[PDB]
From a paper:
However, the parasite also displays members of variant protein families on the surface of infected erythrocytes, including the multidomain [name] erythrocyte membrane proteins 1 ([name]). These [name] cause infected erythrocytes to adhere to the surfaces of blood vessels and tissues, removing them from circulation and protecting the parasite within from spleen-mediated destruction. [name] binding is mediated by a subset of Duffy binding-like (DBL) domains, the DBLβ domains, which are found in either A-type or BC-type [name] (26–29).
The [name] DBLβ domain interacts with domain 1 and 2 of [name] through a complex binding site, the location of which is compatible with a previous study, and binding is mediated by 3 types of interaction. Secondly, a loop from the DBLβ domain (residues 1107 to 1117) interacts through backbone–backbone hydrogen bonds with [name]-1D1 to add an antiparallel β-strand to the A′GFC β-sheet of [name]-1D1. Finally, the interface is stabilized by a cluster of hydrophobic residues found on an elongated helix of the DBLβ domain and 2 subsequent loops (residues 1102 to 1139). This cluster complements a hydrophobic patch on [name]-1D1 which has previously been identified as important for [name] binding by B-type [name] (27, 35, 36). In contrast, mutation of 3 of the 4 hydrophobic residues that contact [name] (L1102, I1106, and F1113) reduced the interaction affinity by more than 200-fold, highlighting the importance of this hydrophobic patch for [name] binding. However, the B-type binding site is more compact, and the overall structure of the DBLβ domain in this region is more similar to that of previously characterized non-[name] binding domains. An overlay of the 2 structures, based on the DBLβ domain, shows that, while domain 1 of [name] is in a similar position in both structures, the protruding A-type [name] binding site fixes the C terminus of domain 2 at an angle that is ∼30° different from the position that it adopts, relative to the DBLβ domain, when bound to the B-type [name].
Residue numbers in the entry:
A (entry chain A): 733 to 734, 741 to 956, 963 to 1057, 1061 to 1171, 1197 to 1200
B (entry chain B): 1 to 186
The structure:
Amino acid sequence: PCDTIYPAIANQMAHQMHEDAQTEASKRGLAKLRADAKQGIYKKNRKPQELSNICNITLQHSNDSRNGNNGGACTGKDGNNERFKIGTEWKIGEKVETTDTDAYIPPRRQHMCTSNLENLNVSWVTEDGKAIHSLLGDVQLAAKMDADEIIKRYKKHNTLTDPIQQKDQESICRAVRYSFADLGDIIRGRDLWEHGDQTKLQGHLQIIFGKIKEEIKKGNDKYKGDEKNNPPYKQLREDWWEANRHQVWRAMQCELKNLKKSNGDCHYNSRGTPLDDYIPQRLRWMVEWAEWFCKMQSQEYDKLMKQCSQCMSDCRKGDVNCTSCEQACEEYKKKIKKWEKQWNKIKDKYEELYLQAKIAFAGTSFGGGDRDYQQMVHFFKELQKVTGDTTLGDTTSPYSTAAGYIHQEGHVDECTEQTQFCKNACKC
Amino acid sequence: QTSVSPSKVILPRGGSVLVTCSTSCDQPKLLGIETPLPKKELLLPGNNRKVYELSNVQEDSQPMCYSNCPDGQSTAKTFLTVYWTPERVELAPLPSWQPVGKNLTLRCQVEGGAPRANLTVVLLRGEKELKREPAVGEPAEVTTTVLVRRDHHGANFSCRTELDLRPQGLELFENTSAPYQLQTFG
Ligand SMILES: *[C@@H]1O[C@H](CO)[C@@H](O[C@@H]2O[C@H](CO)[C@@H](O)[C@H](O)[C@H]2NC(C)=O)[C@H](O)[C@H]1NC(C)=O
Ligand SMILES: *[C@@H]1O[C@H](CO)[C@@H](O)[C@H](O)[C@H]1NC(C)=O
Ligand SMILES: *[C@@H]1O[C@H](CO)[C@@H](O)[C@H](O)[C@H]1NC(C)=O
């Protein structure tokens, strides 16, 4: 539905997902995984660096195998200025055309500032035995560099004034928070985008943790046989992120500090650490697809009416104003059916998983074209019992459909004369 | 032309799974799944997409989707894997009383357990291993020989089945058997 008004529970579910992440990480080696960038070595440099305050970090604080360049993390990223160009087209993943991916990568995710982690030298991290702290250094580096890039490129690809509007400041804080959450799914092997760079990037990660499990084994280790999990080192990578997540976010606050908005979705700039990383990745991209879609519809709609203002306020039926309005009403329709084609695969994949959790019982695990079935249906299953909707045949819960999810937790305000993702002057 | 989601599934016997067949054609002639498993179609407004609730899957199953796209009938299949803990795990009937020095043989029976690829059995004395081998045949027969020494007078002997679903995403499940304490005399 889109009667009574239903509660907002996105923060309540990731909170339980945060409680479970902590409790099982404390069962294993959470404390022996806490790190700070000040305790690592970079460039095989043993000289004192001033990484107490992580804001003081620079590009030289990196185990990049190249680092002959000036660009450290954002090297070869968005050479066409389309990362935050409003209304840019989304892409599909690459893997073998088996169980075709409904994963639509956001534009900020494709041009993510990660060139340092992609060309990482695994030696300089594990040659010393401080691989934990030497790893958080490069993670906080890409985190702080990308926060500087996102706030910068969004203000250029959309040409924002000095008094930035509060809806745009909220749109950036969410974009930064979406970037912080994507990073956590990279470390844990939860990332959906399978590119030639990501596979090599994940190849360095597996090697690094393989030394980290043996690093804190100084005897009995709580990660017995973790190499034979999918993703590899599943438990160890999940625990490592929980230990240092408050610091990866503290790294980005060094760049979010200059945004003058402190309420709403920028509530996490100064206070606290956000819970977006414990919300599944397919959902965070669904709301981001909804945002850039509503930003795209508002543009095409205002362009349409500037050409067709004549034809409904006097244009005759064959003049320039009708052919001008003919192309405008065909170009506007050409764009929406482009995007709704993506929304069709999204809404149908969302429906497959929500109902999958009602009939599948304890001990059901999936593996296919995408890794994230097993984590997705478990989120809904815990969600379906918090809302109480597990009988197959109930529609009270608005989370029954994909559009109903964006109605509750999404933040799409800018769609004009059409706020509908749900349904159940052009011809002069 | 035809797709299926999900692709590889591991579920406990007696449960349910939801499989979806979809085609690139948006008005295909026919669309359905072919499996001997009890299905129950769930009515959705999709005309190029049909979903089925397969109930009480007891063994391995490989259903296939068929959709009638004007370009030629297309097919796509899924692979279901069933798992369950072994039913009977038991040691060979042996007397509690043994004299010193005798050669003792111990067999452990493993009835069931699936999938046998990820199922191994261990023969233990207290919490020390003696032999560790996968489970083959039903009942899976595994044996080892121990010489009777009287310093283990009253020590517990047991075997344990051990199936791990860690690589596929689940937990490892294990079963201990009845303990046999030998009484050494002489
Ligand atoms: C073999 O072990 C499995 C667990 O690996 C047993 O199934 C569990 O039984 C326990 C009781 O010990 C229950 O608490 C669990 O809920 C059961 N788990 C599941 C997933 O079924 C099984 O009963 C054991 N078999 C024998 C013959 O003892
Ligand atoms: C059993 O585990 C092995 C890992 O040694 C794996 O290769 C195999 O696929 C598993 N068996 C299955 C999934 O049936
Ligand atoms: C099993 O071993 C323990 C060793 O501490 C012993 O106390 C017990 O008597 C043994 N036998 C049993 C429990 O039948």
